[PDB]
């Protein structure tokens, strides 16, 4: 008896998604997942509000599911604003709706399928743990999320028994006018094999170009950047060094039809427990007229249920801010040409990297365990890595 508006913007596989609606079986929850599927290609703010508002009073849909393909971030803003006033859950499955906003409205019920900067920062260290990388030289800019990126890295460094060496936290300001030298001299302090860059994709080229003027972008180093720096993996600004590593959301395996089924399941699973535990059905005034007096009825009891939702053994739980607790994060690496290729995947703090050794003097050495000459032992249960006076050695 609950209707969800699966809104799609632009060209997308609507037919394939509609197939999953029939296969969506939730008889255990005993809630009928009505789907108000609609298709449209005008992502302008007027159309998206008037489409939701018109469908609000059409059949009193409790929740809204949104999908998109544009790279603009303004859609996630309006959906958060819409969900705040209407008090109706909105899921940012695809496109600009999945672009995570650090701060949302207090009353907003907008949840997004994406990782946080802190989640991507911790994944950056996991790939540095696998290959025994213990140098950081974090380079950031004045982007709003730069504090949470550094704080998570610093918090993880000082709360772990692994030996992490942070060299510098070089910070650059892009607001200077004719200040190319001011930024350039700041980067001259780099003396490390790894730089954890955090900046806009446009600002990344400027930093890379300044490093290109220095020339020490990458020859035996490695630069690790979040999905924000990579942006659209289809286009490369040709200044990104070969070997760039990015922690991007799973846009390849996690296709849009699969997301809609999970997105629909999230709303009904949370809603099913709301009508059974609290014995209250969410039926607010769906009209948009005089929204000031429409705030008397509160649907915030459903927020505690949308936060904790499980489906098919997968913890599809959203954080308080709105992002996923357990996202399907993959790692993309620049190829020999200018193409991004998946190297590994991350799920539940587990890194299933497909590379046993990182490719790039370096020479392989054989070894046999015998006598005090070579003694092999398992990894340290306490530190988690090779102990003092010990080096790693693989085995087939």
């Amino acid at each position: 008896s609950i209707g969800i508006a699966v809104i799609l913007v632009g060209t997308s596989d609507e037919v394939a998604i509609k197939d999953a609606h029939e296969k969506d079986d939730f008889h255990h929850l005993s809630v009928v997942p009505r789907v108000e599927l609609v298709a449209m290609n005008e992502t302008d703010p007027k159309s998206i509000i008037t489409r939701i508002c018109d469908l609000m009073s059409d059949r009193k849909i409790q929740g809204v599911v949104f999908a998109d393909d544009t790279d603009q971030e303004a859609i996630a803003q309006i959906l958060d604003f819409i969900s705040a006033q209407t008090l109706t859950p909105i899921l940012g499955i695809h496109g600009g709706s999945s672009m995570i906003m650090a701060d949302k409205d207090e009353s907003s019920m907008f949840f997004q399928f994406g990782p946080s900067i802190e989640q991507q920062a911790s994944v950056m260290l996991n790939i540095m743990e696998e290959y025994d990388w213990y140098i950081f030289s974090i380079v950031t800019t004045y982007f709003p999320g730069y504090q949470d990126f550094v704080n998570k890295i610093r918090s993880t460094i000082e709360n772990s028994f692994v030996g992490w060496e942070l060299e510098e936290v070089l910070l650059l300001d892009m607001s200077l006018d004719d200040g190319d030298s001011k930024i350039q001299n700041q980067l001259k302090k780099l003396q490390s094999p790894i730089i954890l860059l955090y900046c806009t994709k446009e600002e990344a080229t400027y930093i890379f170009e300044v490093a290109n003027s220095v020339g020490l972008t990458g020859y035996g180093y490695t630069w690790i950047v979040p999905s924000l720096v990579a942006g659209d993996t289809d286009t490369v600004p040709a200044e990104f060094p070969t070997g760039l590593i990015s922690v991007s959301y799973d846009e390849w395996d996690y296709g849009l039809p699969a997301r809609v089924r999970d997105g629909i399941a999230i709303i009904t699973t949370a809603a099913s427990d709301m009508l059974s535990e609290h014995s209250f059905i969410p039926e607010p005034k769906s009209s948009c007229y005089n929204t000031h007096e429409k705030r008397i009825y509160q649907s915030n009891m459903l927020n505690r249920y949308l936060i904790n939702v499980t489906f098919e053994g997968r913890n599809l739980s959203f954080s308080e801010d709105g992002y996923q607790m357990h996202p399907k994060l993959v790692i993309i690496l620049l190829n020999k040409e200018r193409k991004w290729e998946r190297v590994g995947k991350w799920k539940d703090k587990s890194l299933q990297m497909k590379y046993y050794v990182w490719p790039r003097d370096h020479l392989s050495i054989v070894t046999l365990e015998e006598a005090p000459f070579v003694i092999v032992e398992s990894v340290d249960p306490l530190s988690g890595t090779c102990m003092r006076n010990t080096v790693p050695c693989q085995k087939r």
Binding site: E158, N159, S160, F161
Partner: protein
């Protein structure tokens, strides 16, 4: 030895004290609790910090 030295410190530097023994009974060693994977001091160092 330490209390006799402490009483001397209090008299000269003019401060009052309330001596309490350490609850854990350990001197201090940085260890990570498996409950939260957070490095914390146990003993007199946990109390002081």
């Amino acid at each position: 030895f330490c209390i006799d030295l402490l009483i001397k410190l209090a008299r000269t530097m003019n401060f009052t004290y309330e001596v309490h023994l350490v609850a854990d009974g350990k001197f201090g060693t940085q260890e990570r609790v498996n409950n939260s994977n957070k490095k914390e001091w146990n003993g007199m160092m946990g109390e002081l910090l």
